[PDB]
């Protein structure tokens, strides 16, 4: 297995200037003819001409219209086409080929494939070589002239990149369309779509050049009524890039296409963005509330790539975070501005500190710019995306909005139309840094360590107040644990957004301040501080670190009630919960280990419970924020703080804490559940697919969170409310009614009721599957077998497989059954899926990422299943390399 190394980058000895394709789709095969107009580069040293080409059936290959002969002049091993150098011209030449591929049976969903009745491509990262021969790497920029032909009745809509410059009829009921795309692009941005697509369209007029842009959103005919929100989101995305960054769309048309079978969320092919249907299609009758934020962020994300990824592209794949981290950051700015809810930023932090922090303390830990790879299909990680986004966001925190925008424009103007590297972005930010500091000696050299250093920094604090001097000191320390990528970890440039809260009146004591920690430790002193403050640390979550605030629970309660920053309030609550969890966990663990017949548990802090009540009863407080404060931290956040975590003991710990708080607040919860109904479930705009109210959706989140707490608590007669909830028109509500009925004898009645409501919409049925999968049922293993036999069957749709199994793996008590039967079940699914879709098989490995953090018995059980999977003779390259890294083999 070849290992590619970042330091080994070298430009190709060849140039591809023009790609001319004819893609002829037939019933049993697709014929791809390609002419490459090529040249010899200045780096050429007379090497063989080697093309990437995977799984291609060669009809012929030619150079300058002379047919080449296998064996004497070229070899092909189903991976690399080698033309021996004595037959390679020494000046401009044409290479041509005709190959046969088979999209109908391409169940790995890479290259050219068939999703239901739509022919569709997915070429990032190295999938273009599955369509035709190429030097398949993003620095090989070329012009593209693409003709597609197909049966007209089956495939009336034909799409590719660029302008449609001809449409024509063909004998035998066929037709063709020619697309010319003159701007240079890398081959991973090529795309083609053919199908019986229906659409919605609009015209957007750009802000400055006043150019008309045609916007088209496409789906199969059955779901065309679910396209309107995506179209609205596209218009919003275009306006945000104009308003915040001054950036306008450059092309005459932008197409968005939904397909049912897709490995990820969506893909930014130039002018032809292709989406998992679950990230483009929604309607209020057939989608849960989460769909609306998902579509907004994914449409936005693919649109923002037109600059950060498409117009400025990548020199090589080790620069992936340059487009993905930066585009996620742009997506998050956009989403925060559109939703106008503090929970948007909180949701991103919550994902980072659970899923990404787990990755970064796992054997899979890597920097956002790795040093090596074997499989590109495994490279697309929450580290590269979400830690990358936080590294991109930290520049905005350091520079402020005005100077950030200045540096960003420098990046765009200098690199537009070219490949780029992470250093090009740091350089642009550094220019803005020198301007902000008014110091041409200032630099961001240390900042580059965010790209090369793996692991999560730990930042800890000590404080001093001198009441006579009115002098306050914050002593800060940073530490990153050594790992397999760096034995010695260097201090990073850590920006710490801080406030100082006056504990007597809750007011700010200083102006906005961002401490620049550049050493292993530093002391920040503040004069004229009239009273001892409570510090508000890492406001907005200003660096991707473990925060150790060294605050008392009394101080954290004051921040939770009175601080101005949503994250610090949320984090103070998180930290209070974590202290309680660790304490009760150890108490339960000791009672288990010592086989005690009686023992004590330390109760939940009464003043903390009072503060939760205070915030819940505040009419002016935010409903989304309220739903966070009544929820314990995620299990995958908790596990970063416990060695040899016994999942049963943790489940007992959470159960005790939830019961402690509910024993005091359940009447409050019930009162709010009833009083929130009017606004949360208001039907005024139910039939307006353009009207989306994120505050109202957060009210439903709060109601459904409270109903869950009350149902688990067996609150008197709460089953009455569950049954009435099941009659709500909103799928978020009636699906919640299914999950919370798990604790009652009506569960299977609601199972059948909600199945009937879901089964005729493909995406709604997948949401139903997820709801069943995560149901807190003692008979969940029997229920999953029922799902397999009656609904899932042998579907190869990744959305179906992921819906049935991934939510269940988050069932702390049942997935981690001490028998190991949950580990066995998911391992069987991974191996089955690996036969046809290695990338999705590796996604299904997610539960195993924490294997070496569990108690020694569960470590052994997980390791056995992972070694069993590794022994499968037919294991894919993707899955083998992933499990070898994960098991430290
Ligand atoms: C899940 C998330 C982050 O929401 C998302 O959808 N991310 C997008 C994105 O980055 N869009 O811009 C994306 C697009 C394509 C791939 C990909 C697909 C393949 F078939 C490959 F073989 C491969 F190597 C990579 C991976 C992620
Ligand atoms: Mg083949
Ligand atoms: Mg505008
Ligand atoms: Mg996102
Ligand atoms: Mg289906
Ligand atoms: Mg290792
Ligand atoms: Zn992306």
Author numbering: 196 to 1084
Give excerpts from the publication.
P. falciparum M1 alanyl aminopeptidase (PfA-M1) and M17 leucyl aminopeptidase (PfA-M17) are two zinc-dependent metalloaminopeptidases involved in the terminal stage of Hb digestion. The PfA-M1 enzyme is a monomeric protein consisting of four domains and is widely believed to function in the cytosol, although localisation to other compartments has been reported. It has a broad substrate specificity that includes most basic and hydrophobic amino acids, but preferentially cleaves leucine and methionine. PfA-M1 uses a zinc-dependent mechanism to catalyse the release of single amino acids from the N-terminus of short peptides.
Here, we report an M1 selective aminopeptidase inhibitor with a hydroxamic acid zinc binding group (MIPS2673), which targets both the P. falciparum (PfA-M1) and P. vivax (PvA-M1) M1 homologues and demonstrates antimalarial activity against a panel of drug-resistant P. falciparum strains. The binding affinities (Ki) of MIPS2673 towards purified, recombinant PfA-M1 show the compound to be a potent inhibitor (Ki = 211 ± 11 nM), with >4-fold selectivity over PfA-M17 (Ki = 921 ± 69 nM). Our structural analysis showed that MIPS2673 acts by chelating the catalytic zinc ion of the PfA-M1 active site, similar to all other inhibitors produced to date. When bound to PfA-M1, the position of the biaryl of MIPS2673 compares with that of our previous inhibitors. The moiety makes similar interactions with Met1034 (hydrophobic) and Glu319 (carbonyl-pi). The fluoro-substituents sit deep in the S1 pocket and form the same intricate network of water-mediated hydrogen bonds as 1, in which the fluorine atoms act as H-bond acceptors. The substitution on the tert-butyl, replacing a methyl with an alcohol, is difficult to definitively position in the structure due to the rotation around the C-03 bond. It is possible that this alcohol could form a long H-bond to Arg-489, which should provide some improvement in position and potency. The Arg-489 side-chain shows two orientations in the electron density, suggesting that some rotation of the alcohol is occurring. Orthogonal label-free chemoproteomic methods based on thermal stability and limited proteolysis of whole parasite lysates revealed that MIPS2673 solely targets PfA-M1 in parasites, with limited proteolysis also enabling estimation of the binding site on PfA-M1 to within ~5 Å of that determined by X-ray crystallography.
